[PDB]
Design a protein around this ligand. Structure first.
Ligand SMILES: O=C(O)CCCC(=O)C(=O)O
Ligand code: NI
Length: 450
């Protein structure tokens, strides 16, 4: 037909380019990647069941480069335009996170691909928050932020041209995709020179460090990039030795044979300097960049997430409120005890409808595909070894803040306001998981001549 490259391939290239840029800016991220690779190879060598699970789902091939990014934007126009940028790469808005509950003036979505085959080529996802200036009570500070954000243009003209070209023509060829990746990178690069005066930065920062992070810079720099490890417990044991001691509180469920959602922790990655126009030849302020690591397990159904939320809430009530480093050991013990009630058996997770799964025809099943008298049900085919299943991996967010901006774990006027700013409706991640499960069953039925 045409010579356009796949949006999935652009996404993979963009993720790799973002990772190279971030590693140049934050060398301890490179240190983390080396540790992740070694941990992951150890798991696959020592745990054949994990290696086989990743083979069945195709995740073995996506794992090494799998990342998420997090960014914050300041205006509705920025959010709507960034949705168009991400669409070039097959990254659509999935989910709505209203973080005003946890005491942060933002609401968010995650831009990512949605179909198992797309995700196999690249599962790159960018959690994108929009600052809500109307939640800044001090009028003078809100007016300052609005004035500063209105002046900035976070996209290069060439990036905007290529986005419009992609929309009008239906894609980009390889050369234009390469140009697009490099132009898009400018939006996310770190810029030391703040766009405000030293005093303006001071006012923005004391209200909330997140407000200065958004308002005082040229654009939405990478807040962090997070690689995927197969064993967060193991990586935590290796991190202090590399100068990235992480938080003892691990967000998410406790250690499980069959992980659910994701587990996360964070560390201090770099102390950065911020420079101002009015105070040159003088010491500029400093700001910390935080890193993160995650392990991704099974996507949960509504019923599964209700159980997860219940047991996590019970853990927090038993602790007395806020999990902190000072009570980390007690919290982790309470977490393990309360989550004993969440089945840690794939067969029960499936039969009780707690997680999503993908199903696959086995070699034994394929060899029998012309036999009569085979089992008449899905369970019978599983029991006879004709169908194999594995959990469908979670692609979304608890969410958690590496920089400690909000309390962890979350998910109509606010949603309507978000979607009006975004320019479209967010997709339902749970519906998308159900569709992936259903597609696997249909492919299995065809492969087995059922
Ligand atoms: O912008 C932030 O502070 C955190 C964004 C959410 C996130 O990255 C995660 O859940 O891993
Ligand atoms: Ni993150």
């Amino acid at each position: 037909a045409n010579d356009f490259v796949s949006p999935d391939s652009i996404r993979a290239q963009f993720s790799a380019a973002m990772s190279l840029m971030y590693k140049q800016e934050v060398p301890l991220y490179g240190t983390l990647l080396e540790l992740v690779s070694e941990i992951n190879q150890q798991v696959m060598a020592q745990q054949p069941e994990v290696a086989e699970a990743l083979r069945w789902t195709g995740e073995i091939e996506r794992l090494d480069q799998e990342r998420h990014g997090a960014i914050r934007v300041g205006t509705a126009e920025e959010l709507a335009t960034i949705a168009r940028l991400f669409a070039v790469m097959g990254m659509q808005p999935v989910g709505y996170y209203d973080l005003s509950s946890a005491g942060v003036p933002v609401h968010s979505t995650a831009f990512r691909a949605v179909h198992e085959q797309s995700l196999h080529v690249s599962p790159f996802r960018v959690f994108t928050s929009l600052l809500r200036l109307e939640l800044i009570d001090n009028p003078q500070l809100r007016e300052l932020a609005q004035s500063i954000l209105a002046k900035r243009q976070i996209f290069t003209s060439r990036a905007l041209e290529l986005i419009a070209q992609c929309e009008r023509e239906g894609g980009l060829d390889a050369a234009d995709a390469e140009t697009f990746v490099q132009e898009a990178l400018h939006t996310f690069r770190w810029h030391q020179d703040a766009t405000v005066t030293a005093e303006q930065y001071q006012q923005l920062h004391d209200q909330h460090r997140l407000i200065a992070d958004v308002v005082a810079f040229k654009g939405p720099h990478i807040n962090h990039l997070t690689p995927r490890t197969l064993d967060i417990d193991a990586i935590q044991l290796g991190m202090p030795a590399k100068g990235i001691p992480p938080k003892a509180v691990v967000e998410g469920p406790p250690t499980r044979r069959h992980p659910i959602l994701l587990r996360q922790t964070s560390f201090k990655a770099l102390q950065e300097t911020v420079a101002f126009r009015d105070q040159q030849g003088r010491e500029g302020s400093h700001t910390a960049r935080f890193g993160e690591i995650e392990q991704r397990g099974a996507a949960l159904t509504p019923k599964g997430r209700q159980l997860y939320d219940k047991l996590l809430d019970a853990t927090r009530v038993a602790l007395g409120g806020a999990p902190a480093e000072a009570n980390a050991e007690r919290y982790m013990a309470l977490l393990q005890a309360n989550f004993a009630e969440f089945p840690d058996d794939l067969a029960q997770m499936r039969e009780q409808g707690l997680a999503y799964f993908r199903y696959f025809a086995t070699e034994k099943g394929l060899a029998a595909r012309d036999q009569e008298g085979r089992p008449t049900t899905l369970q019978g085919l599983i029991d006879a070894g004709h169908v194999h299943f594995e959990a469908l991996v979670y692609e979304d967010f608890l969410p958690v803040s590496a920089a400690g901006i909000f309390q962890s774990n979350l998910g109509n006027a606010n949603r309507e306001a978000f979607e009006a700013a975004l320019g479209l409706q967010v997709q339902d991640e749970l519906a998308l998981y159900a569709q992936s499960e259903r597609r696997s069953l249909q492919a299995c039925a065809q492969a087995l001549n059922l």
